[PDB]
Amino acid sequence: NLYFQSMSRVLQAEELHEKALDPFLLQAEFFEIPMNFVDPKEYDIPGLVRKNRYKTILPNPHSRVCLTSPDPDDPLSSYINANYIRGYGGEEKVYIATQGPIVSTVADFWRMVWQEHTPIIVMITNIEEKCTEYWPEEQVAYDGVEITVQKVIHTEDYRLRLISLKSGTEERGLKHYWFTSWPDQKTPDRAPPLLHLVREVEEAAQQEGPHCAPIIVHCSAGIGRTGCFIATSICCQQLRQEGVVDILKTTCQLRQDRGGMIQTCEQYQFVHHVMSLYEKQLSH
């Protein structure tokens, strides 16, 4: 309750199924949740306009990712439009929510990946787009790190790139999940593919072992789709642990970390469809 008083609505199975199908109650609830957007005038940095795809969608200062190499003291050099996001139960820095890289921010995004030892990127952008193609066909170096795409795995609903990051003696792997099945219509029947992504990614995160480095999630602005992904992930853990979901409270927690997470009412509803689905699957 740091930037606003968070809200709660604990759903057991039956209310979750019913809630997901009550759009009047969903909007009533949704449009009461504080957006917690940042005043653009918060950042007074020459050159900053080139670093943001949208002038009004900015990282909240208190949780922004600051790029400490090569000049932690230069506002511009240290800036990226990204926030650390708490996961389930408030675990610090489970995800990073960020905008889709733009031409002038590609090198910055990789700086972030390296700084953070990020093992997994989730990119949620249709093939028809917006977002810049920030990874190489095969290989490229930025700022002393060699990005090598080692393999492209095509699945029904995403393409998985296995990437090598090299600098010095040292070397790390990265999984890059490009999700291409994001619906224009957020109807129940378009929920299974996002569910499958969430599950594939939480498994992969588990496989990283104790204290996983931050998972980078991005769509155009880093709030709408990005927020849907992350809330769904959190609520999957909550349902499995607690036998209930609290998407209201999860959304609130998300918006404390980064303003506008889950941007639309149709997105909010979609998280409910997905979680209704999962609960049904989990009962078998």
What does residue 162 show for φ and ψ, rounded to 5 degrees? Answer: -95, 120
Query: Any binding-site annotation on 184?
Result: yes
Query: Any binding-site annotation on 221?
Result: yes
* Method by which the coordinates were obtained: X-ray
Domains of the chain: 1-284 (3.90.190.10)
Query: Any binding-site annotation on 230?
Result: no
Query: Any binding-site annotation on 222?
Result: yes
Query: Any binding-site annotation on 223?
Result: yes
Token pair recorded at residue 112: 């972030």
Residue 284 class from Cβ within 10 Å (0-12 exposed, 13-18 middle, 19+ buried)? exposed
Catalytic residues: 219
